Design an enzyme around this catalytic site. Structure first.
Site, PDB file in Angstrom:
ATOM      1  N   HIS A 132       0.809  -1.217   0.000  1.00  0.00           N
ATOM      2  CA  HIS A 132       0.000   0.000   0.000  1.00  0.00           C
ATOM      3  C   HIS A 132       0.845   1.270   0.000  1.00  0.00           C
ATOM      4  O   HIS A 132       0.276   2.367   0.036  1.00  0.00           O
ATOM      5  CB  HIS A 132      -1.004   0.009   1.166  1.00  0.00           C
ATOM      6  CG  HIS A 132      -0.391   0.032   2.537  1.00  0.00           C
ATOM      7  ND1 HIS A 132       0.508   0.995   2.945  1.00  0.00           N
ATOM      8  CD2 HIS A 132      -0.596  -0.769   3.611  1.00  0.00           C
ATOM      9  CE1 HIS A 132       0.852   0.772   4.203  1.00  0.00           C
ATOM     10  NE2 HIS A 132       0.196  -0.292   4.631  1.00  0.00           N
ATOM     11  N   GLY A 135       3.496   6.004  10.484  1.00  0.00           N
ATOM     12  CA  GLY A 135       4.815   5.802   9.916  1.00  0.00           C
ATOM     13  C   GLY A 135       5.480   4.488  10.271  1.00  0.00           C
ATOM     14  O   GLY A 135       6.630   4.265   9.871  1.00  0.00           O
ATOM     15  N   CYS A 163       4.463   1.369   9.434  1.00  0.00           N
ATOM     16  CA  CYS A 163       4.234   0.270   8.505  1.00  0.00           C
ATOM     17  C   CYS A 163       5.554  -0.229   7.932  1.00  0.00           C
ATOM     18  O   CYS A 163       6.494   0.539   7.719  1.00  0.00           O
ATOM     19  CB  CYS A 163       3.295   0.710   7.382  1.00  0.00           C
ATOM     20  SG  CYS A 163       1.652   1.138   7.970  1.00  0.00           S
TER      21      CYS A 163
HETATM   22  C1  LIG Z   1      -4.481   0.876   1.696  1.00  0.00           C
HETATM   23  C2  LIG Z   1      -3.896   1.443   2.953  1.00  0.00           C
HETATM   24  C3  LIG Z   1      -3.925   0.816   4.201  1.00  0.00           C
HETATM   25 CL1  LIG Z   1      -4.696  -0.766   4.338  1.00  0.00          CL
HETATM   26  C4  LIG Z   1      -3.374   1.357   5.364  1.00  0.00           C
HETATM   27  C5  LIG Z   1      -2.744   2.609   5.319  1.00  0.00           C
HETATM   28  N1  LIG Z   1      -2.177   3.229   6.441  1.00  0.00           N
HETATM   29  C6  LIG Z   1      -0.832   3.803   6.303  1.00  0.00           C
HETATM   30  C7  LIG Z   1      -0.552   4.782   7.431  1.00  0.00           C
HETATM   31  N2  LIG Z   1      -0.764   4.151   8.734  1.00  0.00           N
HETATM   32  C8  LIG Z   1       0.124   4.051   9.738  1.00  0.00           C
HETATM   33  O1  LIG Z   1       1.300   4.391   9.636  1.00  0.00           O
HETATM   34  C9  LIG Z   1      -0.285   3.511  11.087  1.00  0.00           C
HETATM   35  C10 LIG Z   1      -0.096   2.245  11.517  1.00  0.00           C
HETATM   36  C11 LIG Z   1      -0.548   1.888  12.841  1.00  0.00           C
HETATM   37  O2  LIG Z   1      -0.453   0.792  13.352  1.00  0.00           O
HETATM   38  N3  LIG Z   1      -1.147   2.904  13.568  1.00  0.00           N
HETATM   39  C12 LIG Z   1      -1.351   4.192  13.156  1.00  0.00           C
HETATM   40  O3  LIG Z   1      -1.891   5.030  13.854  1.00  0.00           O
HETATM   41  N4  LIG Z   1      -0.887   4.443  11.889  1.00  0.00           N
HETATM   42  C13 LIG Z   1      -2.116   3.611   8.861  1.00  0.00           C
HETATM   43  C14 LIG Z   1      -2.385   2.612   7.749  1.00  0.00           C
HETATM   44  C15 LIG Z   1      -2.698   3.269   4.084  1.00  0.00           C
HETATM   45  C16 LIG Z   1      -3.255   2.688   2.967  1.00  0.00           C
HETATM   46 CL2  LIG Z   1      -3.144   3.593   1.461  1.00  0.00          CL
END
Ligand SMILES: Cc1c(Cl)cc(N2CCN(C(=O)c3cc(=O)[nH]c(=O)[nH]3)CC2)cc1Cl
Ligand SMILES: Cc1c(Cl)cc(N2CCN(C(=O)c3cc(=O)[nH]c(=O)[nH]3)CC2)cc1Cl
Lengths: 306, 306
Positions: free
Chosen positions: A41, A143, A145
């Site tokens: 993603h 941030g 991921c």
């Molecule tokens: C298709 C898709 C999906 Cl499925 C998820 C995201 N996100 C990316 C940014 N993000 C974090 O970095 C994050 C992780 C966490 O555990 N807790 C928190 O608060 N934030 C959330 C998920 C973006 C896209 Cl485009």
């Protein structure tokens, strides 16, 4: 003596963490040999979160759309591909710090260490368990991921988890390193819910053995029970049923303490039906289920790694 | 018109099946490019079934301990390795009939075709679903290990299952092609039990839509219901709860028939509480849950493959 939530030493993994940028999106990648692994993603924008078509999104990208940084050194992307839910970026330089590694898929109830990272830089390490509903109760901010979970077996790092998202309830979901999700989740920013969680019974028993080893004995009693009698009470309290395989796994702990598994089950039955009445076990007022029998043996008998 | 338990055409897979012999044990292997994949318990003997140490068993083998036959042609093993629960045998000849393929891990409720094989020779093909307890209700006799499950997406074969064992209840357990088991099972001939199965609700709804498309309408009614009201009845009858994601998946079937999903749920509620009273649906006196929404669309609207 003593008992702590102990993680594996993270050094072998810290050297594999890189920063991956695609467009305005930056997250973490895992650099092993000449491949960088990261959540797919990263190629999504705000317009595609709800229903991305990853095949279309990827065909519209070229190698130069991907910026990969290992500290300050920049890595040249020479190829890209998608394996399920992970992106595989081939780079021109093989990681000289690549440890002996393998990709494993873990089962609910097993534990691993998480190296939480931001902008490719390691921030902290902690231990957690894969829940029976295929989520983990992690600690992750924006941030994070691409952060990975791992175990260390001798000299070999077993990677088992890559972080993808946080669910509305505040728990976390991800994939193995082949890109296959744990649980019935998909990488789309829609509303998904985890199923009901249960308590990992074999882990609670292991933790009670750790307590006895460390001098907490107040919950023991002379009674015994059968597997079927115990499992009848356990299901009432949302505990995973106990199998003969679990009894065998607890063998080394039963031998070290001289307390049979079915004897310890009788103590657990009493704690479920009466509570703990203001008493604590290993500094906890609740029954802890995120230590496996192996975790206890490792900490209450001694194992190191090369 | 009509509705059948339809499998994918097996031709692309039949050309990849080989026979693997190690000692007195013969089972099936999957030959893609220059690698043969097979269950690792082929290196076990009767003395090790209950508690094999696969690392020890493998170090005591050499390449010439493995006999691989593709029909009558013999394949020369030039290397061997273990990836989780599958053995990877490198051979000197790449399979000229290797199709476009990928390795995928499927979720409970999804369907696939099984090519049952014996001594490397294809015997039959059938369709089945991955149950919510991570078993499949297959048809396998002695010698069927290494048979594979697959889907076909356009020109690409997605391998999702390799057969390893039969459980005492007569159901079957195996791994994905990376060697990771579906469910909490291990490749040891000990007594293991599957957890309780449930009925795949979204599949039952898809099958009811197939019935309407084919002229079975007697179970319809004017009522409607909510997701939470339905799920309350469903849990009473050991049905998987229904999510908003499931409702969206059933969209194309609701549009083709003009019957809203929540309307069809009201019919299902009535069938659960009153039964079918000697009436049949699509030639069945029970509610069928091994057709996905995609299976129905494929058969009731038309999709072929190249
Ligand atoms: C298709 C898709 C999906 Cl499925 C998820 C995201 N996100 C990316 C940014 N993000 C974090 O970095 C994050 C992780 C966490 O555990 N807790 C928190 O608060 N934030 C959330 C998920 C973006 C896209 Cl485009
Ligand atoms: C460690 C181990 C394990 Cl785990 C399984 C086996 N078996 C190999 C032989 N076998 C079948 O071919 C078979 C499959 C089936 O589905 N139904 C049926 O009746 N027979 C049973 C499993 C052997 C070993 Cl050494």
């Amino acid at each position: 003596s003593g008992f702590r939530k102990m993680a594996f030493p993270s050094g072998k993994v810290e050297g594999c963490m890189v920063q991956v940028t695609c467009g305005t999106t930056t997250l973490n990648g895992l650099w092993l040999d000449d491949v960088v692994y990261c959540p797919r993603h990263v190629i999504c924008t705000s317009e595609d979160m709800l229903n991305p078509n990853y095949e279309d999104l990827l065909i519209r990208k070229s190698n130069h759309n991907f910026l990969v940084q290992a500290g300050n050194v920049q890595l040249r992307v020479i190829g890209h591909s998608m394996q399920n839910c992970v992106l595989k970026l081939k780079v021109d330089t093989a990681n000289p710090k690549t440890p002996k590694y393998k990709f494993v898929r873990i089962q609910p109830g097993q534990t691993f260490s998480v190296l939480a990272c931001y902008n490719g830089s390691p921030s902290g390490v902690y231990q957690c368990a894969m829940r029976p509903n295929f989520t983990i109760k992690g600690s992750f901010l924006n941030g994070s991921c691409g952060s990975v979970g791992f175990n260390i077996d001798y000299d070999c790092v077993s990677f088992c988890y890559m972080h993808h998202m946080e669910l509305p309830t505040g728990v976390h979901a991800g994939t193995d390193l082949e890109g296959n999700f744990y649980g019935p989740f998909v990488d789309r920013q829609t509303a998904q819910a985890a199923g009901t969680d249960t308590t990992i019974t074999v882990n609670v028993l292991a933790w009670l053995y750790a307590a006895v080893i460390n001098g907490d004995r107040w919950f023991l009693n002379r009674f015994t029970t059968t597997l079927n009698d115990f499992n009848l009470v356990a299901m009432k309290y949302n505990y995973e049923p106990l199998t003969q395989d679990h009894v065998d796994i607890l063998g080394p702990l039963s031998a070290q303490t001289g307390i049979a598994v079915l004897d310890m089950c009788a103590s657990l039955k009493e704690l479920l039906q009466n509570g703990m009445n203001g008493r604590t076990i290993l500094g906890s007022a609740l029954l802890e289920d995120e230590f496996t029998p192996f975790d206890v043996v490792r900490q209450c008998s001694g194992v190191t790694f090369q």
